[PDB]
Amino acid sequence: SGFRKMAFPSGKVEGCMVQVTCGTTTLNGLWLDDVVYCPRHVICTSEDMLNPNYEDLLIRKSNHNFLVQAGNVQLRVIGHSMQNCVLKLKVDTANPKTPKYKFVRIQPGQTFSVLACYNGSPSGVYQCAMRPNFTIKGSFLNGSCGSVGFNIDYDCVSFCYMHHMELPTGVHAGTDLEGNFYGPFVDRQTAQAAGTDTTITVNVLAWLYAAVINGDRWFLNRFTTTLNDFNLVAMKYNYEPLTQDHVDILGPLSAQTGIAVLDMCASLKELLQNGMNGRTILGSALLEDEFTPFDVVRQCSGVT
Amino acid sequence: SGFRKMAFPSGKVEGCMVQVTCGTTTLNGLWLDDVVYCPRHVICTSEDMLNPNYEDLLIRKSNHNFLVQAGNVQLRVIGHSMQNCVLKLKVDTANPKTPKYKFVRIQPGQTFSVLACYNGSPSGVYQCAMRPNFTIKGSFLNGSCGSVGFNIDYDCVSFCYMHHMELPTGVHAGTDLEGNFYGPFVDRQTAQAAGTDTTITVNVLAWLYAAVINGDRWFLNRFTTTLNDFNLVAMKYNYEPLTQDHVDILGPLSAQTGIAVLDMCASLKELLQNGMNGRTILGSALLEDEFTPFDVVRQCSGVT
Ligand SMILES: O=C(Nc1nncn1C1CC1)[C@@H]1CCOc2ccc(Cl)cc21
Numbered sequence: 001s002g003f004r005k006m007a008f009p010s011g012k013v014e015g016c017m018v019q020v021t022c023g024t025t026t027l028n029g030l031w032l033d034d035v036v037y038c039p040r041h042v043i044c045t046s047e048d049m050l051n052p053n054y055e056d057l058l059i060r061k062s063n064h065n066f067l068v069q070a071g072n073v074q075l076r077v078i079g080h081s082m083q084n085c086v087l088k089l090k091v092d093t094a095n096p097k098t099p100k101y102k103f104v105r106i107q108p109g110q111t112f113s114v115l116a117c118y119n120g121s122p123s124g125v126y127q128c129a130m131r132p133n134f135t136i137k138g139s140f141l142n143g144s145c146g147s148v149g150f151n152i153d154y155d156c157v158s159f160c161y162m163h164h165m166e167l168p169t170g171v172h173a174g175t176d177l178e179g180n181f182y183g184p185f186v187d188r189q190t191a192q193a194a195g196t197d198t199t200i201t202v203n204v205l206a207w208l209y210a211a212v213i214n215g216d217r218w219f220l221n222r223f224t225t226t227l228n229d230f231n232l233v234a235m236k237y238n239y240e241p242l243t244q245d246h247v248d249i250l251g252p253l254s255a256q257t258g259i260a261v262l263d264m265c266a267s268l269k270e271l272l273q274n275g276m277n278g279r280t281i282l283g284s285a286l287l288e289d290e291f292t293p294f295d296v297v298r299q300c301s302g303v304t
Numbered sequence: 305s306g307f308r309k310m311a312f313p314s315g316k317v318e319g320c321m322v323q324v325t326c327g328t329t330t331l332n333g334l335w336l337d338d339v340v341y342c343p344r345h346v347i348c349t350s351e352d353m354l355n356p357n358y359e360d361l362l363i364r365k366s367n368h369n370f371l372v373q374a375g376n377v378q379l380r381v382i383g384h385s386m387q388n389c390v391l392k393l394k395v396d397t398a399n400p401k402t403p404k405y406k407f408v409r410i411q412p413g414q415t416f417s418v419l420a421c422y423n424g425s426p427s428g429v430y431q432c433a434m435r436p437n438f439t440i441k442g443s444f445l446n447g448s449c450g451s452v453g454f455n456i457d458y459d460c461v462s463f464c465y466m467h468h469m470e471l472p473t474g475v476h477a478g479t480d481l482e483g484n485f486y487g488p489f490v491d492r493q494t495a496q497a498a499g500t501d502t503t504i505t506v507n508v509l510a511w512l513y514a515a516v517i518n519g520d521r522w523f524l525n526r527f528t529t530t531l532n533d534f535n536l537v538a539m540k541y542n543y544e545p546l547t548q549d550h551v552d553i554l555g556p557l558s559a560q561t562g563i564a565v566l567d568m569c570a571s572l573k574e575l576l577q578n579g580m581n582g583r584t585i586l587g588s589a590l591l592e593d594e595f596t597p598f599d600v601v602r603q604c605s606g607v608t
């Protein structure tokens with residue numbers, strides 16, 4: 001028993017991290033097969049960032065300007081191209097440590113592990129969720145750009161995020177591995193509105209099920225609710241509206257604990273209306289929304 | 305910016321994980337050089353666990369009874385010995401993926417990453433602290449025994465914990481890599497008292513400094529306190545008494561933010577006496593004690 005904010009083991013990703021330097025800018029790249037992926041802003045100086053013309057800036061660069069280093073060994077760049085906000089540096093050597101991998105665009109509300117890196121070196125790993133507003137609340141300092149988010153299914157690493165920037169509000173923004181930003185963000189030093197964020201209701205319900213499985217049941221009550229009534233409360237408390245698709249995804253956890261989804265919804269409604277009253281659920285004094293129903297099942301059945 | 309409960313990258317540890325089977329029991333082992341380390345209770349059946357005579361149980365085992373598997377390849381056991389609560393299985397092959405490593409006995413209140421494993425396969429990684437009462441609050445299911453806790457300093461992995469058991473209270477207990485239990489625990493299925501636990505005061509102060517560095521300052525106030533006065537409040541709220549050694553370890557964070565340690569102590573005293581009042585600090589609605597002052601400095605300066 002026990003339930004923790006668990007990251008995927010990062011080994012397969014560590015073997016893909018490289019350092020990319022262009023001019024005076026150094027950040028991280030992801031080396032898969034014979035391509036290194038990195039944020040295109042590696043080609044900007046600090047002054048270029050107000051409003052960079054990336055197509056023009058990239059035209060002044062040649063393959064020999066992109067210094068790619070994997071640990072201590074230097075990679076030979078034989079091509080470069082910009083795809084949305086990422087650069088693809090073709091190298092003459094396929095990464096011998098390339099795992100089975102896929103590039104995926106995750107949905108808001110889904111979770112992933114981030115391997116935070118500096119100068120191509122892994123610093124740490126943490127699990128987070130993509131907020132409904134397409135930002136992530138990470139831990140990223142200058143030089144962390146190019147760090148990636150991923151999930152693993154057996155031996156296949158699905159890369160879903162590459163880190164690009166910190167908005168003036170301290171929240172984080174990045175792209176899929178085809179360089180498409182999640183959300184409305186652009187890779188320029190300008191104030192940018194992140195939309196209204198909401199709490200990921202299906203994740204909070206999943207975590208309440210994780211709580212019951214792991215011994216915490218104080219919040220269970222004698223009530224039930226309906227999707228309509230629960231969504232009125234979800235509206236008031238800035239929670240994502242619950243749908244039958246969300247209810248279906250909670251099916252396995254509802255079957256495992258014997259607590260109907262709408263009965264768990266009534267517990268959540270009471271917690272929203274009354275708070276925790278100085279109590280905790282799985283070491284938390286707030287309603288946790290960074291575990292999907294899949295994460296709860298995977299953690300509770302010990303999937304390797 | 306941003307502050308997360310970050311684990312060390314687990315790659316170097318993943319390469320050391322093996323599956324050890326003895327009879328009908330399977331758990332994890334740590335393969336370093338030509339030795340595999342695992343909990344001695346791999347030699348018990350479920351019935352042996354009430355009160356096992358480990359010396360007698362081990363006498364009925366030969367090297368050929370310990371099945372050690374690294375991924376798909378089988379290791380040849382050429383020796384076995386019990387050291388406290390761990391077995392050391394000498395194998396004929398040194399692990400080619402053995403990193404630079406040390407075995408260390410951590411102090412209560414220190415933190416470490418756990419790589420949770422099942423059948424020799426890594427499932428996830430999370431950071432936790434050794435409680436003042438020598439238990440850990442992990443996420444461990446049947447078969448997770450043998451999973452290890454560690455810290456990394458550049459390229460050296462200091463292994464500090466090997467998981468042995470879950471107490472009837474749902475908390476976790478384990479040993480150092482020489483098989484000495486942390487705390488009063490014994491590897492037998494019997495009810496065992498974990499001592500009175502306390503909150504790790506120096507860690508909460510470190511995390512309050514991490515909060516200030518990362519933009520959260522609502523809790524800062526116009527007051528100060530003394531070690532004596534703060535310790536009266538620490539006593540009442542079951543916090544570890546603060547010493548000048550703790551104050552010295554917070555020196556770097558006090559110098560970085562310009563907030564004297566006793567002034568941060570007055571903020572903590574007000575938070576203890578009045579609560580958060582429905583507010584949060586770094587995404588938490590309670591006072592976090594799983595970040596040491598070293599973790600805060602390391603996270604805030606991007607150490608790889
Ligand atoms: O955000 C950036 N780096 C970053 N990403 N996570 C953390 N950090 C550092 C600032 C704390 C760079 C520097 C600031 O100016 C910009 C502007 C646009 C872009 Cl794409 C990147 C950047």
Ligand SMILES: O=C(Nc1nncn1C1CC1)[C@@H]1CCOc2ccc(Cl)cc21
Nearest residue numbers: 001345444445446468469470491492493
């Ligand atoms: O605790 C144990 N395994 C374990 N450790 N973390 C999680 N879990 C499973 C139970 C949930 C085993 C089985 C229970 O009985 C015992 C008794 C003594 C010893 Cl050393 C190990 C064990």
